Amino acid sequence: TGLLDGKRILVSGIITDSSIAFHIARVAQEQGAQLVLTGFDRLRLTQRITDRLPAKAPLLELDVQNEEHLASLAGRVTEAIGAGNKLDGVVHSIGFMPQTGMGINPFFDAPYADVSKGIHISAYSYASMAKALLPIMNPGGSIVGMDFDPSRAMPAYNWMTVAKSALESVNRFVAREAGKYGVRSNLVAAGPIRTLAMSAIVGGALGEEAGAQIQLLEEGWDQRAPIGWNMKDATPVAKTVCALLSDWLPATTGDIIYADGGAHTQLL
Amino acid sequence: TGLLDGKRILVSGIITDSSIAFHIARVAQEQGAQLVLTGFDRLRLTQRITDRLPAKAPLLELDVQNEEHLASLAGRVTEAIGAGNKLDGVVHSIGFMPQTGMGINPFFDAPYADVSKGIHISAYSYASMAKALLPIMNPGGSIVGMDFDPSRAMPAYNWMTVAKSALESVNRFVAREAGKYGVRSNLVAAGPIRTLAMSAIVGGALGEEAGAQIQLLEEGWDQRAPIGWNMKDATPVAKTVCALLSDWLPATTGDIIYADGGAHTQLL
Amino acid sequence: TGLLDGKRILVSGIITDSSIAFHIARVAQEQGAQLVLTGFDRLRLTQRITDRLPAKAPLLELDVQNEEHLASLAGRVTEAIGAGNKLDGVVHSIGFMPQTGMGINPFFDAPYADVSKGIHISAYSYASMAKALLPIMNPGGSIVGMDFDPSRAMPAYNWMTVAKSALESVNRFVAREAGKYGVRSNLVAAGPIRTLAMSAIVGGALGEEAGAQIQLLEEGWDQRAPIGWNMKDATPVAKTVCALLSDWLPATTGDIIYADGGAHTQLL
Amino acid sequence: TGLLDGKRILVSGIITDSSIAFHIARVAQEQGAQLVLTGFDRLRLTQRITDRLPAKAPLLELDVQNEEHLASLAGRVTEAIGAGNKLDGVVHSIGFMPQTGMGINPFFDAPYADVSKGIHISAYSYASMAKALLPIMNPGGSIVGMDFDPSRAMPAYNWMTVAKSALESVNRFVAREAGKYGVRSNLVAAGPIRTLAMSAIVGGALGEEAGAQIQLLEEGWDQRAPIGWNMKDATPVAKTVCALLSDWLPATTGDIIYADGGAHTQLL
């Protein structure tokens, strides 16, 4: 009806109702989009969470590390949206880093296997999602991934920040490939969102000093955001993703939109 | 009706029908916005150009270097939109650099007075427009200025690039001030647009080697843009500005949106 | 004898013994360089300060806003270093912004004349120094200016940050011109140094809230500097400038070296 | 005797005499440094290459993917430099990406195992080298890794660019850890160097179009370098690394020094 009217959009990464992807999906639906959802390891839970969406959406299984899931993904989406229909939009809202790559675990002590797994899911999967789905995307389409500005190092995020640096770089290459399809690829760099995991880390699940650091990070973020930053509100990020999913940023690709309150533009 | 429905938006910088601001204004109107226009030194011409807009819009005089124009500006806009109404949107699409600051004139030979004038109109005026208009802007409002990525030096643009670097920096401070009003401030970094002036420089008005360089710049831009770059089409930039004028990028301020085909994200 | 042995280097910007340029000059002398100094409005004071340098150095008057000073500068330097001798090194350590462009004076209230003056001295003069001196610089030479990272807005520095953004951009163009002479042009982005002016602003000369903000800026800087930041020690910055003046960064030009403790690479 | 007099420096990554690390090692020796070298899979060859160095240097085996090599590394270096002696300097000049991650092999077709291996050797190993060696580094020490600016995507370099983005990010975290030891960590972003591998790719070993693209990349680099770029001369990069290994950039860490001719600062 409005922003995304008629668009067909795959949204990955809903796991709980505080998933950023939950709000992206909600807002996209409110904006006229038709969704296909993907979920990874807790499918029954995703479905039960997604029941709360403004509209029903087919849910497909996708373990971004499973090569068969990816191989079959486009066929499954075509099944879900019907033959001869294509996606206009793909949202990657997927990220993971083993606990060793994060928080109080010393940066040097994260074993490569762990880091590799995190980079697989958090960075490489952006490309492999774009590989699976570009064949079934319309000209004018839009792939959006979720980013957390890794331009500068920060406490606790450790190897996830490295993963995000890799993602940003993947995104620029995906844009090169997507452009052949008339498709844009972009990242939304969000401010900290109080996701279940984030609340758990502030509460110390990855060590006390990590939790204290991330709490300071959050406070500093809202302080230097010229328009403030509400970490309990994923809506301004969901809207931003929708902005990129829409026809309203048609000359932007390979790029990063910062939905962070303007915090990254301010030193103090 | 759509993107900018109900919004009231001042658009500066229409001088010809190939002004970027012409397309911004056209698109904003198509998207439901109500406009107040400003024009500088050729008011009769601006009016005659703007007659072609989808809707009529009050045109106000604003010479960004005239302190009285700025002092009176908000009152004049309030007159134009009616008492008790405010602006939701301000577009700065203003830039100028004396010929000595550009093209074949050696970078070192631009006299400071010339450079100063260019920086006044091209950079400082962004702040002084925000000063004049923030008192008459609604919470949730949006100031947008036009940028040309000055991260790296380039032939011919010389002191205008310096002016743009200054603008980017002004924009981050304006965001600090705007945030007090619940207002975002952002720049759109556009790709090269074949504006009358740009066509004139490609044709050699600022020297042959400058024209040859800018023609190469343009070709290179479209080449590395993963989705291409059409310098004859200001529409993708107008849409981008509208995107920023809208409620769809609500967490972005002090920032730069690149409507350049993705060209800045690619080396070759 | 060591780093700068045999090099002839103009150093501007010594005004007190806590001038960054004082330490640059001291270190360059310790490293074998032969200096010509320039001073602006307090020549007797500069001379008396410079008497403390490890070696005597001719002092020349240069008001970067005085076109005759600039016109005569190279002849005066040639007089000072002797006919047929050239400079290997130029240090721009010059900056000024009227009080209205800074601190507690609202960013919007700085009159353009004031801002223009600040940008003249702080940014444009880098080019006009390079114009005066490149004709008398040797292949392999090095121009270095002093920068304060203006990538993000910050309290109190207001229009000086804008000035620094303009400088960074000027530096990239100066590099284009300098390269014709076989000369590098680069900026050193220093951390906050407790210069007389800086101490005065921390003490509130530009308003209490500005002083409080700059004190917080300083503390935050040392906190996120992975190797710390000592604002009372200009030596690590002087060394960095010498590094750039030397043959040891021969492939770096148009660029910015950050002598800030690594602070800019860290978010928190 | 000069720049690195008395310093003890581990240099990894010599494999042929056109290895960047060969020139780093040569220059460091010329500058007074005492070296320990490491070599990976062709030890007899490294030794035979290193015989040509100005001075003899113990060569140690280090397969950055071998956890036992890393576990033993510091003991082996202490053996080589003698008990109670420490390193002042560590050079990481290590990089690898399987052919599938590069050139004409479509970016989407690089299998994760391949990419992971490349990121292991090219990015993660920078951290794991810093882990092995920081316990045996002196305050004031310097770790330097080799970077190729991955800020923008480019043809052919594909997943190696992603690897370099990951490296840059690793470097910022390593700086955090190194600072505890009084140690700096920095990257040198070099211009293209005609290394054996690079010559082989220009000659088409990774596909014709890749070779054509990299040849264009190289030409463009020298064109926009304000001081030119000689891809056949690794010396300006070796000097830059030495600059970072020295006491002359003491306030720089977590950072990237661009030894690229200034090319990255120029658009065209």
Ligand SMILES: NC(=O)C1=CN([C@@H]2O[C@H](COP(=O)(O)OP(=O)(O)OC[C@H]3O[C@@H](n4cnc5c(N)ncnc54)[C@H](O)[C@@H]3O)[C@@H](O)[C@H]2O)C=CC1
């Ligand atoms: N929460 C925050 O503060 C910020 C998060 N982000 C990013 O937003 C994106 C979404 O995460 P959030 O909503 O915060 O957390 P979340 O935990 O709600 O979402 C992460 C999603 O990744 C999915 N996932 C993990 N491994 C997978 C695999 N092998 N295959 C398929 N899917 C897999 C999870 O199932 C989950 O649905 C992530 O990329 C995250 O890094 C970006 C900025 C800030």
Ligand SMILES: NC(=O)C1=CN([C@@H]2O[C@H](COP(=O)(O)OP(=O)(O)OC[C@H]3O[C@@H](n4cnc5c(N)ncnc54)[C@H](O)[C@@H]3O)[C@@H](O)[C@H]2O)C=CC1
């Ligand atoms: N044409 C291009 O390739 C690109 C242009 N831009 C920027 O877009 C903005 C709009 O310019 P264009 O549409 O290209 O050219 P234009 O010439 O159509 O618009 C420039 C406008 O600035 C106005 N102006 C000049 N001095 C003024 C003053 N003292 N007071 C008030 N207004 C004044 C002019 O009247 C004109 O309307 C400028 O900021 C320009 O630098 C940004 C990227 C690319």
Ligand SMILES: NC(=O)C1=CN([C@@H]2O[C@H](COP(=O)(O)OP(=O)(O)OC[C@H]3O[C@@H](n4cnc5c(N)ncnc54)[C@H](O)[C@@H]3O)[C@@H](O)[C@H]2O)C=CC1
């Ligand atoms: N103090 C700090 O924390 C930092 C300073 N910087 C920069 O370092 C450079 C040196 O300044 P500082 O040593 O801090 O202060 P300073 O006050 O000791 O040096 C500023 C110099 O600029 C000179 N100057 C001013 N107007 C002039 C004109 N019209 N012509 C010629 N010279 C003129 C002054 O005489 C003075 O010698 C400046 O560019 C400053 O912005 C950069 C980063 C940090």
Ligand SMILES: NC(=O)C1=CN([C@@H]2O[C@H](COP(=O)(O)OP(=O)(O)OC[C@H]3O[C@@H](n4cnc5c(N)ncnc54)[C@H](O)[C@@H]3O)[C@@H](O)[C@H]2O)C=CC1
């Ligand atoms: N050649 C170029 O144009 C540029 C190269 N660089 C970087 O310079 C660094 C040095 O490479 P180059 O001198 O060009 O090539 P090179 O092939 O001479 O050096 C690469 C080195 O990495 C070592 N290596 C590979 N796998 C290893 C492992 N598992 N364990 C230990 N060492 C291993 C190789 O043995 C070789 O010595 C690399 O990081 C490269 O990416 C950076 C910019 C430009």
